[PDB]
From a paper:
PACSIN/Syndapins are EFC (extended FCH (Fes/CIP4 homology)) domain proteins implicated in endocytosis because the C-terminal SH3 domain binds physically to the large GTPase dynamin, the phosphoinositide polyphosphatase synaptojanin, or the branched-actin regulator WASp. Consequently, it has been posited that PACSIN operates at the intersection between endocytosis and actin assembly. Drosophila Syndapin consists of an N-terminal membrane-binding EFC domain (residues 1–304) linked to a C-terminal SH3 domain (residues 439–494) by an unstructured linker including an EH domain-binding Asn-Pro-Phe (NPF) motif. We have solved the structure of the Drosophila Syndapin EFC domain (alternatively termed F-BAR due to the gross structural similarity of the EFC and BAR domains) that, together with the recent crystal structures of the human PACSIN 1 and -2 F-BAR domains, reveals unique features of this membrane-binding fold.
The structure of this domain (residues 14–301) was solved by X-ray crystallography at 2.7 Å resolution by single-wavelength anomalous dispersion (SAD). Monomers dimerize in an antiparallel fashion to form a six-helical bundle core (α2–α4 from each monomer). Residues H121 to T122 and Q125 to I126 form two short β-strands hydrogen bonded into an antiparallel β-sheet scaffold, at the tip of which are positioned two hydrophobic residues, L123 and M124. This prong is surrounded by many basic residues that are also conserved in Syndapin homologues (K127, K130, H120, H121, R129, K28, K137, K35, K112). Yet the radius of curvature of the Syndapin EFC dimer (∼21 nm, assuming prong residues insert into the bilayer) is significantly smaller than CIP4 and FBP17 (both ∼30 nm) or FCHO2 (∼55 nm) making the packing angle of the Syndapin EFC dimer more similar to the radius of curvature of the N-BAR domains of amphiphysin and endophilin (both ∼11 nm) than to other EFC domains.
Numbering used by the authors:
A (entry chain B): 14 to 298
B (entry chain A): 14 to 168, 189 to 303
The structure:
C-alpha cells in the first residue's frame, strides 16, 4: 500500500524537507512580485504628476486656482512614496529575512539538500533490519507457495503412472520418490515461513520505535518552518496595512488645505491687475 | 503698451473665455488619466492574485498554513476593488459633472464659442467711438508734426501761409485731444461694464473648479474608505488561523506514523 510503514515510503516525509526549500523560493517570489506592482503604481503616479505638472504650468490656468489643481499632483506624490516604502519594506524587511532563514537551514552538497539526504539516510538505517525480515518473509512466502504447487502436480503424475503399466520400475519409483520429497518440501517450507513471520512480528515494535524517532525529527523541523512562515505572513501584513501608514490622514488633510485656498477674488483681482481695468493708461496728450 | 486700455488689448480677457472651455477638457483628461492608473493597479493586483492562487494550490504548502498564504490574495483582491471604485467614481461621476457644466455654460455658433464672440462684440462696440477719436488725434498729430517739418526748411510766399499752417494744426491737434479727453469717462465706463461681465462669468468657472477639486478629493481620500480597516483584520484573522499543530497532525495521518499498516501475516496457498 501507500502506508508510511511500507519500505521506502518515508520518502513523502523527506520530500517535504525539500518542498520546504521550494516554498521559501515561492514566498520570496510572491512578495517580490507584489513589490513590483507597488513600484509600478508609484512609478505611474509620478510619471503622471510630472506630465500634468508641466501641462498645467504651461497652460492657461492661473492663481490660487492653478495652485489648487497642483494639489492633486502633490497628493499623488505623497501616495507614491507610501507605495515605494511598501516596496522597500517588502524587499528589505521581509524578503531578506526569508532569504536568510533559507540560507541557514538548507545546505547544498553533492547535488542534494543535505538536510534531506541525511534524513533519508537516517530512515534507511532505521528501516534496514526490518527490511531484511520483510525480505525473508517474502522468500519464505514464495518458496512455500512454489513447494505447494510442485507437490500438487507431483501427486498428479503419480496418478497416471500407477495407470501406465508399461513404465519401468525405476520410472514408477522416481515419481513415488518425488511426491514424498516434495511433501517434505511443503513442510520444511511451511515451517521457515511461520518462523519468518514470527521473527519479524517480534521486531515490529523496535521498528516502530525507530521510525517514530526519525519521523519526529522531521516533524520538529517542519514545525519550525510553519511557525516562521506564519510570522513572515504577519510581517507582510504589517507592510501592507494602510490603516497604519500614519501619514495618510495628513496627505488628505493637506490636500484639502490647498483646495480651500482656491480664492476666486484673489484670482480675479490679480487678473484685472495684469490684464484688465486696473492697469495704467496714459491718455493722449 | 500692453495695457488693456489701448485698442486691441481687451482680447486677452477674451482668449480667457475660450481658455476656460479648454481647461474643462484638460481637467477631464487629467482625471481620466488618474482613473486609468487606478485601474492599472487594480488590474495588476488581480492578475497577481490569480497567478499565485494557482501556484499555491499546486505547490506543496497544505493545511491552514496554506489558507494563510491565501490571505494576501484576498487582501489584494479587496484593494483592487477599492481602486476600481476610484476609477468609477472619478469617471462616471466627477467627469460627467464637468461635461455637464461645460455644456451648460458654453454654446457654439458654428465652430466658435458664442459667449466669447458675444463679449468680443460688446468690447469692440464700446471701444469703437473712442478708437475713432484716437484715430483723429493720430492724424492731427502727424499733420502738426509735418507742419513742423514744412516750416523748418522754410526758415517769400512759403513763409507766412505755413505760420498759418502751424496755427491751424496746433489748433486742431489741441481740440481732438480736448474731445477724446472728454470721452474718456464714457469709454472707461463701458469697457468697465463689459469687463465686469467677463469677470462674473470667469468667476463661475473658478468656483466650479473648486467644487470639482473637492470632489476629486473625496474620491481619492483613503481615510474615508469604510471597508479598509476591516480588510486588514479579515487578513490578519486568516493568518492567525495557521495552526501548525493541526497541519502536522494531518501529515502524520496521511503521510506518517499514524497511518494504518498491514503487518505480515501467514497467507495460505491458492
Ligand atoms: Na498656468
Ligand atoms: Na498546496
Ligand atoms: Na488559532
Amino acid at each position: 500500500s501507500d502506508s508510511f510503514w511500507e519500505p521506502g515510503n518515508y520518502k513523502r516525509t523527506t520530500k517535504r524537507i525539500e518542498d520546504g526549500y521550494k516554498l521559501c523560493n515561492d514566498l520570496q517570489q510572491l512578495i517580490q512580485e507584489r513589490a513590483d506592482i507597488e513600484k509600478g503604481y508609484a512609478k505611474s503616479l509620478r510619471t503622471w504628476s510630472k506630465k500634468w505638472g508641466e501641462l498645467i504650468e504651461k497652460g492657461p490656468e492661473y492663481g490660487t486656482t492653478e495652485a489648487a489643481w497642483k494639489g492633486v499632483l502633490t497628493e499623488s506624490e505623497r501616495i507614491s512614496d507610501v507605495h515605494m516604502k511598501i516596496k522597500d519594506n517588502l524587499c528589505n524587511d521581509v524578503n531578506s529575512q526569508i532569504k536568510t532563514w533559507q540560507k541557514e537551514n538548507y545546505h547544498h552538497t553533492l547535488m542534494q539538500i543535505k538536510e534531506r539526504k541525511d534524513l533519508e539516510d537516517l530512515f534507511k538505517k532505521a528501516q534496514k533490519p526490518w527490511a531484511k525480515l520483510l525480505a525473508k518473509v517474502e522468500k519464505a512466502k514464495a518458496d512455500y507457495h512454489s513447494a505447494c504447487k510442485t507437490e500438487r502436480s507431483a501427486t498428479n503424475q503419480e496418478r497416471n503412472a500407477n495407470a501406465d503399466s508399461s513404465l519401468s520400475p525405476d520410472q514408477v519409483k522416481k515419481m513415488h520418490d518425488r511426491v514424498q520429497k516434495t511433501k517434505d518440501q511443503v513442510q520444511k517450507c511451511r515451517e521457515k515461513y511461520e518462523q519468518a513471520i514470527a521473527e519479524i512480528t517480534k521486531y515490529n515494535s523496535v521498528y516502530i520505535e525507530d521510525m517514530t524517532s526519525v519521523f519526529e525529527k522531521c516533524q520538529t523541523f517542519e514545525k519550525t518552518r510553519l511557525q516562521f512562515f506564519k510570522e513572515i505572513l504577519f510581517n507582510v501584513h504589517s507592510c501592507l496595512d494602510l490603516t497604519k501608514v500614519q501619514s495618510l490622514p495628513q496627505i488628505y488633510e493637506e490636500f484639502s488645505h490647498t483646495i480651500n485656498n482656491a480664492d476666486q477674488q484673489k484670482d480675479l483681482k490679480w487678473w484685472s491687475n495684469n490684464h484688465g481695468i486696473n492697469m495704467a493708461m496714459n491718455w493722449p496728450s
